[PDB]
Design a protein around this ligand. Structure first.
Ligand SMILES: *[C@@H]1O[C@H](CO)[C@@H](O[C@@H]2O[C@H](CO)[C@@H](O[C@@H]3O[C@H](CO)[C@@H](O)[C@H](O[C@H]4O[C@H](CO)[C@@H](O)[C@H](O)[C@@H]4O)[C@@H]3O)[C@H](O)[C@H]2NC(C)=O)[C@H](O)[C@H]1NC(C)=O
Ligand SMILES: *[C@@H]1O[C@H](CO)[C@@H](O[C@@H]2O[C@H](CO)[C@@H](O[C@@H]3O[C@H](CO)[C@@H](O)[C@H](O[C@H]4O[C@H](CO)[C@@H](O)[C@H](O)[C@@H]4O)[C@@H]3O)[C@H](O)[C@H]2NC(C)=O)[C@H](O)[C@H]1NC(C)=O
Ligand SMILES: *[C@@H]1O[C@H](CO)[C@@H](O[C@@H]2O[C@H](CO)[C@@H](O)[C@H](O)[C@H]2NC(C)=O)[C@H](O)[C@H]1NC(C)=O
Ligand SMILES: *[C@@H]1O[C@H](CO)[C@@H](O[C@@H]2O[C@H](CO)[C@@H](O)[C@H](O)[C@H]2NC(C)=O)[C@H](O)[C@H]1NC(C)=O
Ligand SMILES: *[C@@H]1O[C@H](CO)[C@@H](O)[C@H](O)[C@H]1NC(C)=O
Ligand SMILES: *[C@@H]1O[C@H](CO)[C@@H](O)[C@H](O)[C@H]1NC(C)=O
Ligand SMILES: CNC[C@H]1N[C@H](CO)[C@H](O)[C@@H]1O
Ligand SMILES: CNC[C@H]1N[C@H](CO)[C@H](O)[C@@H]1O
Lengths: 392, 390
């Protein structure tokens, strides 16, 4: 999408994985989808360093809407859970230096069953702009035809443009195409700032593995489509939640950097461990994800329950991720000729290698003919940065 | 097995899951299966509080053997990796106040391909006794018949008895029977101090779930046979390794206590987090696992992606574990009438309830009329101890 937005992958927070569609504010008040949840989350995004790290978009997902539109056919926030309204929430968010994302559906209803935007694309776009929305995640439930799907996605893209407000446009279009036909990613990129490709993430290592395995299996088809203005979206970061070991969290952070993924945390910033926070706020890894060249990485090698991924960065640098997929035993040794990394460019004539994950260690100068040896924890990843150099 | 041993579930350390069959001491000297590894673990078991917490048996698994037996037909430790011999290793372990466990196989070869004990049962038992071995894990690979399997396990039990030395006897007999016929756990308990029922654990939440689901699936068959002298073995604790989140480690510790499981850590005591250490050394949870009554717990309820397990303890007390198996979202609320717990006696007329995991907190007194509500983390467990007021 050529709207001047998402020149690097969007960074923020999105409620869906951690909070889902909890409407029971009487018995689960700290988990329910309410304006107080988002206000507190914005406060912590400021005070706990998240905005400084680059997480800027505070995003509402499904289940914010009143069950029906108003008399003038406009969407309404829930009067009990969002009594002060989206525009006041947006003013509060903007006053913290943050941006506000919201959710709508291309079809007749949201996936949870709330008012869809079909037949109201222009109304809803102008409504969001009037409220001060800075991002829209557009879901694809309740759409009777792929023709209506594509028409609605393109139509909403155009309507958002017509508002004249800069609104990041996040689409689930490809994922809702897959059962019927393969997506044309050139068209999707024409209309969307990023697009969900695969099934919803959940709080499990199984989910991480399946997202990685489908990305790598399909990388011929999606890697080159991504770039400044339009990104592949492998779904939310779930670091800080319950189902990932420390090494599996390292793997998700490292590989979302490799994949040039949007970094949308879905966690509770009121209850997050220091380790998870330091991982999510890791400035070197964020800098890899946010690299200005904006070329998505890929799986370079796979075998013996190992994976090697790499990502080209600005200035002849490369990021290299080694994953140990053996889920038994201890750290396993992996050796590779540095000439095989970075298309043979990264270390020609030499490279300086810095390990960033799981811990930051300068490894030293590696000549083009040398070999790199590492040990990788079960289900963990070693993330390296290679900097091309003529020095020793 | 009525040998005076394992009157509570055996506690110790066993190398297999974390260190496996690593024979490459040239390139991996700190990870290879060698006497140095076991010496370091014994040192840390003393110095880092493991022995004081109850972890007593330092156990060698497969891949300690030389490729062939000795002149008189007796097993030998690998001369390069165990140069000083098992007896001196056992001496060192005993001098730390610890006990030494070793590994052998009922068939013609061990699972990794080293000498089996078929045809050498009495020789091998007497050799282990001479070495000062205190526990034998007896594997089931390379056995060509169910009758040879049963006969071998029973024979090795008898041979160990005949040596005169108290030796904990850990059996994989049921696991190797199960695909072909249902085990008779009365006989197994007669011959074994504990027995592996299900497939090898690995460093994953998936294997924890599989072990729990197969235990509850089989609980009418295995729960009542367990007791002092004879335990179900759901395999090693993997707390402190790489694949389990904090809440999944809590679930393993809590449910291994509920199940009156042997607690054999398989981790690197040289490199273990303070949190994993405090969980593994948790005195209240170990006390539940080690409860003298020795009645294995069971799954009480299952539904709505929740599980409730409970275990009767000495002196009118009960342990209760609640598992949230929903792997998405946040802590989920679960409510149960306390009159439904402990077969209706735990809280009649009332009980004091103490949460032990994931954090310890006294909850207060609950009357027979009361309902207990808790929020349980995805893949985590809330573990409670109930004390009857009487
Ligand atoms: C509605 O849609 C229209 C087009 O459909 C869109 O305008 C387009 O996008 C941007 C607007 O920001 C324009 O791109 C600029 O073009 C000028 C041409 O000289 C360049 O100088 C600009 O370069 C700067 O910004 C880039 C970041 O996008 C950097 O890559 C660059 O290094 C510079 O910093 C920039 O490329 C584009 O030309 C128009 N195309 C048209 C008008 O046909 C408009 O923004 C949309 N409106 C809303 C509200 O979304
Ligand atoms: C070889 O097999 C034989 C037969 O199975 C086995 O003999 C058994 O030994 C155990 C313990 O050594 C005996 O268990 C004892 O039972 C008597 C009852 O007659 C009790 O008095 C004993 O009490 C112990 O427990 C007390 C708490 O209750 C403690 O204060 C203290 O530890 C007491 O010692 C104990 O329960 C069992 O009776 C015999 N059985 C027979 C038939 O002799 C022998 O131990 C095995 N040998 C080896 C080397 O494995
Ligand atoms: C939302 O529902 C309406 C009504 O069911 C859909 O409109 C129908 O569309 C089908 C084919 O798309 C036509 O055969 C019907 O004649 C239409 N009915 C009416 C009353 O217009 C509409 O397409 C649905 N929207 C989406 C996005 O699926
Ligand atoms: C399971 O094994 C037990 C123990 O070997 C058997 O129980 C014995 O049965 C015999 C009859 O053959 C009785 O005389 C004994 O008193 C029992 N106890 C012992 C210790 O031997 C039982 O029969 C077996 N059950 C099945 C179904 O095979
Ligand atoms: C995909 O869509 C774009 C834009 O409409 C078009 O130029 C391209 O030819 C399409 N590709 C295929 C294979 O249909
Ligand atoms: C070991 O091998 C011999 C010879 O092949 C065989 O007769 C014997 O039954 C085997 N023992 C077991 C326990 O499989
Ligand atoms: C297949 N994508 C499903 C989407 N619908 C949910 C909202 O109800 C979340 O936004 C999720 O990302
Ligand atoms: C089916 N159980 C397999 C057993 N063989 C391995 C030794 O090679 C471990 O002891 C494991 O417990």
């Amino acid at each position: 999408l050529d709207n001047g937005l998402a020149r690097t992958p969007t960074m923020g927070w999105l409620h869906w994985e951690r909070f889902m569609c909890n409407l029971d504010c009487q018995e689960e008040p700290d988990s329910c989808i309410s304006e107080k949840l988002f206000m507190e989350m914005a406060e912590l995004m400021v005070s706990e360093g998240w905005k400084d790290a680059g997480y800027e978009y505070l995003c509402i997902d499904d289940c914010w809407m009143a069950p029906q539109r108003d008399s003038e056919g406009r969407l309404q926030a829930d009067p009990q859970r969002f009594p002060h309204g989206i525009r006041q929430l947006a003013n509060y968010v903007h006053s913290k230096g943050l941006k506000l994302g919201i959710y709508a559906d291309v079809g007749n209803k949201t996936c949870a069953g709330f008012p869809g935007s079909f037949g109201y694309y222009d109304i809803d776009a102008q409504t969001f702009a009037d409220w001060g929305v800075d991002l829209l995640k557009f879901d694809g439930c309740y759409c009777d035809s792929l023709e209506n799907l594509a028409d609605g996605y393109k139509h909403m893209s155009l309507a958002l443009n017509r508002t004249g407000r800069s609104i990041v446009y996040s689409c689930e279009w490809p994922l809702y195409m897959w059962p019927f036909q393969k997506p044309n990613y050139t068209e999707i990129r024409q209309y969307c700032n990023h697009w969900r490709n695969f099934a919803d993430i959940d709080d499990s290592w199984k989910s991480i593995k399946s997202i990685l395995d489908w990305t790598s299996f399909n990388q011929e088809r999606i890697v080159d489509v991504a770039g400044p203005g339009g990104w592949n979206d492998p779904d939310m970061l779930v670091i800080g939640n319950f189902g990932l070991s420390w090494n599996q969290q390292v793997t998700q952070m490292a590989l979302w950097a490799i994949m040039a993924a949007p970094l949308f945390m879905s966690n509770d910033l009121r209850h997050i461990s220091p380790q998870a926070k330091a991982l999510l706020q890791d400035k070197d890894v964020i800098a890899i994800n946010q690299d200005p060249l904006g070329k998505q990485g890929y799986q370079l090698r796979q075998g013996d329950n190992f994976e090697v991924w790499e990502r080209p960065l600005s200035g002849l640098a490369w990021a290299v991720a080694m994953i140990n997929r053996q889920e038994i035993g201890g750290p396993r040794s992996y050796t590779i000729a540095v000439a095989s990394l970075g298309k043979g460019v990264a270390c020609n004539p030499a490279c300086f290698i810095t390990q960033l994950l799981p811990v930051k260690r300068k490894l030293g100068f590696y000549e083009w003919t040398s070999r790199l040896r590492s040990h990788i924890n079960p289900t963990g990843t070693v993330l390296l940065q290679l900097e091309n150099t003529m020095q020793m």
